[PDB]
Design a protein around this nucleic acid. Structure first.
Ligand code: MG
Ligand code: MG
Ligand code: MG
Ligand code: MG
Ligand code: MG
Ligand code: MG
Ligand code: MG
Ligand code: MG
Ligand code: MG
Ligand code: MG
Ligand code: MG
Ligand code: MG
Ligand code: MG
Ligand code: MG
Ligand code: MG
Ligand code: MG
Ligand code: MG
Ligand code: MG
Ligand code: MG
Ligand code: MG
Ligand code: MG
Ligand code: MG
Ligand code: MG
Ligand code: MG
Ligand code: MG
Ligand code: MG
Ligand code: MG
Ligand code: MG
Ligand code: MG
Ligand code: MG
Ligand code: MG
Ligand code: MG
Ligand code: MG
Ligand code: MG
Ligand code: MG
Ligand code: MG
Ligand code: MG
Ligand code: MG
Ligand code: ZN
Lengths: 83, 97, 116, 23, 69, 181
RNA sequence: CGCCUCCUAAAAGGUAACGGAGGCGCCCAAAGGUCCCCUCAGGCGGGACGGAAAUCCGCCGGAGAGCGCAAGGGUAGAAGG
RNA sequence: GGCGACACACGUGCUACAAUGCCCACUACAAAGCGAUGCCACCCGGCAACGGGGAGCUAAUCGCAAAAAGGUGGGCCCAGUUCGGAUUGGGGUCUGCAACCCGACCCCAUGAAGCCGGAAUCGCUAGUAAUCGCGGAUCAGCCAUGCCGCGGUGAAUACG
């Protein structure tokens, strides 16, 4: 995965929205186009709306879903099986 | 198994299955119809049903053309039948001398 | 139930024999036999009950094993499946996990062929 | 073994180096 | 007991790998076992064998704090 | 009678601790072990190699006592069972032998169980007896790998003079039966 | 179409109809004699494989089980094992 | 975001099922090409990917570089294995603004199918086939087991 030497990557433009929410006293739904962003320990408890290419999918974040990316919880593909 | 390619056209599972039904006419001769391929297409003047099939005694390669697709599929089958039958009985033609 | 829980094949070289424990490859095998100071060439059937208890004692304490390892791997997938992440989902369908193609192949995850 | 990365033979084929094939 | 159908019970020493020795009775005088109540993890208070982790995951990742506020 | 360590442990350590813990007014009211009844429900020997003389042997080594055979009360279809067929063994350990068995079960056997995480707290009767099932007989010090043809488990009943589950727990726990929760 | 069991059959016996329902034409060398011993089905709880039901442990359980076969009578203070 | 979907079907290939083989170690013999935010000797950290140093070279000078099969020695002993390397868990490295979908690589662990393949069917007549490795275009990286080349070792058989 991303190299330990370099950062733990978050788009800066979401981190701000996250930080702004901590201070003012949380919390509202946060639309984003950042499937690439890591979920970060300060994101826990939010419910972030992740774009999949069609919808912004609501994802409530938990302490167990921390190091993962955002897009891991907003499926890109519709599949109900064959025939 | 059974393979149909519909070229620059949209066709239904209904139509697909109908092709399987027609092609079945070949099962008459009781020889292995190996990996048969039906190709359906639409020229300006009408449809085309192409097919290439390998059997233990050779290959069936033929083509039907008609204003009507269903009719083209049939005309294909005729040619396939004729060839298949030539394969199956040509060997008998020289048991004397 | 020799070491640890499993009875490692006699007749064979102890370095190969130790591989017959879940969670111990070529590598971990090379490592136990140095740390307990015994010849990897010796057949298991030729081990001092001493050399054995050493081997046993080290390995059982150094590395997570047999059932206890499988439990973690299950627990690992357990959670991945329940947080509902994509790698979790692929498990949830028995499908491939590592971004492989599924238009053809993919048989080891799927099972042998399932006719339409 | 050309498909077993964990051997010499494996790494020559993959075009790489490592523990099992050093440089 | 009925004669001739029952294996004899004699004083017997069960020797464990911890180096424990048990004075008991068996149909075999000397036995060597790989484990016992004296050295088994579940028995030995709560000897957390190999995995004294405290999970460790996942809040407990911590590499690092270097993303900014 | 034999001096066997666990037997003595009962009279020395467990006896009194129990009288403390529940306050009995009578020497006979305090919980005793009555019998340990070991059963191999088997029937993997229904027809096949109905030589389970092999198992009767194994049990006879473990308990120091030769089991007697059990046979089916009624004929049963789906298990392939004609009435009168040898499907099980049962050896009834009492007194000294019961103690000797329990000693090794507690000291050596249960330790040797794969992924052993403690006996089951809930396997109690409600009239104060305990039952527990083994998956293999390699658990006992007497049975080596070398000598076994095929893995077979067993049922162990441990029968107490206790009237209640709560009392019987104390007895077995104090004797050293490891309970998980 | 002979034989057995129940009902009809009107509380002794008997009692008809092309009245209502079922069985027999065998079997068992033990499934016979005798001595000794043993007691069921079923319910709840507990117990590796093991399940509604295999075998084991506990409690309750007079007989509802068993008794070669139909039915009836009998029957564990045994006719049952 | 998709082109990477996955009840299925077909074509092309890779790697195998092993002892004329597999692993470890030591040791040989090519050719064609490529190379200035480019190839990178040599030293250092790290099991390693790689990281840090840092010399040379507009290159018949300097580098990619080790060719591999081969040779010597040592293990495996016919076992789904010291065959095979799929799948999965975990830990890392690098490119890149960014590796969830969806990169490659490394290491621990996992260690599938597969015991030579029905009907059918392909290639090749000599430095060919078979087997073995190396380069290049594209290109940040790379899903290349593809393609275009290059040598190494080196057969069988043709009545007709
Ligand atoms: Mg044409
Ligand atoms: Mg292993
Ligand atoms: Mg891929
Ligand atoms: Mg895919
Ligand atoms: Mg290459
Ligand atoms: Mg209970
Ligand atoms: Mg009791
Ligand atoms: Mg044993
Ligand atoms: Mg008569
Ligand atoms: Mg009457
Ligand atoms: Mg009457
Ligand atoms: Mg009357
Ligand atoms: Mg009257
Ligand atoms: Mg009269
Ligand atoms: Mg008799
Ligand atoms: Mg009688
Ligand atoms: Mg008699
Ligand atoms: Mg009962
Ligand atoms: Mg029950
Ligand atoms: Mg069960
Ligand atoms: Mg039961
Ligand atoms: Mg009755
Ligand atoms: Mg009858
Ligand atoms: Mg895309
Ligand atoms: Mg494409
Ligand atoms: Mg196929
Ligand atoms: Mg390929
Ligand atoms: Mg290049
Ligand atoms: Mg295997
Ligand atoms: Mg197989
Ligand atoms: Mg192997
Ligand atoms: Mg291998
Ligand atoms: Mg073989
Ligand atoms: Mg072949
Ligand atoms: Mg081959
Ligand atoms: Mg093949
Ligand atoms: Mg090869
Ligand atoms: Mg490239
Ligand atoms: Zn011990």
């Amino acid at each position: 995965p991303r190299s330990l030497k370099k950062g733990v990557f978050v788009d800066d433009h979401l981190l701000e929205k996250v930080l702004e929410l901590n201070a003012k006293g949380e919390k509202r739904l946060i639309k984003t186009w950042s499937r690439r962003s890591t979920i970060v320990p300060e994101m826990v408890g939010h419910t972030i709306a992740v774009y999949n290419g069609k919808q912004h999918v609501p994802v409530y974040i938990t302490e167990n879903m921390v190091g993962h990316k955002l897009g891991e919880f907003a499926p890109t593909r519709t599949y109900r099986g064959h025939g | 198994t059974m393979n149909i390619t519909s070229k620059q056209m949209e066709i239904t599972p209904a139509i697909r299955q109908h092709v399987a039904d027609r092609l079945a006419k070949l099962e008459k001769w009781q020889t292995h119809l190996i990996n048969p391929h039906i190709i359906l297409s639409k020229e300006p003047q009408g449809f085309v049903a192409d097919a290439t099939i390998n059997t233990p005694n050779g290959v069936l390669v033929a083509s039907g053309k008609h204003e009507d697709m269903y009719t083209a599929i049939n005309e294909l089958i005729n040619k396939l039948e004729r060839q298949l039958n030539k394969l199956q009985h040509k060997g008998e033609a020289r048991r004397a001398a | 139930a020799r070491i640890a829980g499993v009875e490692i094949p006699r007749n064979k070289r102890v370095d190969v024999a130790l591989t017959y424990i879940y969670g111990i490859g070529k590598a971990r095998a090379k490592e136990a036999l140095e740390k307990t100071g015994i010849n990897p060439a010796t057949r298991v059937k030729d081990l001092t009950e001493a050399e054995v208890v050493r081997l046993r004692e080290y390995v059982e304490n150094t590395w997570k094993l047999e059932g206890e390892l499988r439990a973690e791997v299950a627990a690992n997938i357990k959670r991945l499946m329940d947080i509902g992440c994509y790698r979790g989902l692929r498990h949830r369908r028995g499908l491939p996990v590592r971004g492989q193609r599924t238009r053809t192949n993919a048989r080891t995850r799927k099972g042998p062929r399932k006719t339409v | 073994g050309k498909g077993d990365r964990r051997t010499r033979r494996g790494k020559i084929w993959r075009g790489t180096y490592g523990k099992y094939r050093p440089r | 007991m009925k004669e001739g159908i029952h294996p004899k019970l004699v004083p017997a020493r069960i020797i464990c790998g911890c180096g424990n020795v048990i004075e008991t009775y068996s149909t075999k005088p000397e036995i060597y076992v790989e484990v016992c109540s004296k050295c088994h993890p579940f028995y030995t208070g709560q000897q957390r064998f190999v995995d004294t982790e405290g999970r460790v995951e996942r809040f407990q990742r911590r590499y690092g704090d270097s993303y900014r506020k | 009678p034999l001096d066997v360590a666990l037997k003595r442990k009962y009279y020395e350590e467990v006896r009194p601790e129990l009288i403390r813990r529940f306050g009995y007014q009578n020497v006979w009211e305090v919980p005793r072990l009555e019998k340990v009844v070991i059963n191999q429900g088997l029937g993997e020997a229904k027809e096949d190699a109905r030589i389970l003389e092999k198992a009767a042997q194994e049990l006879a080594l473990i308990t120091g006592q030769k089991p007697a055979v059990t046979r089916a009360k009624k004929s049963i279809s789906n298990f392939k069972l004609r009435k009168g067929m040898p499907i099980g063994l049962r050896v009834t350990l009492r007194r000294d032998r019961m103690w000797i068995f329990l000693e090794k079960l507690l000291n050596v056997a249960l330790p040797r169980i794969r992924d052993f995480r403690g006996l089951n707290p809930n396997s109690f009767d409600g009239r104060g007896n305990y039952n527990l099932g083994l998956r293999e007989q390699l658990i006992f010090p007497e049975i080596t790998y070398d000598m076994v043809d095929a893995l077979r488990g067993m049922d162990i009943a441990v029968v107490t003079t206790a009237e209640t589950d709560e009392e019987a727990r104390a007895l077995l726990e104090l004797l050293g039966f490891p309970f998980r929760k």
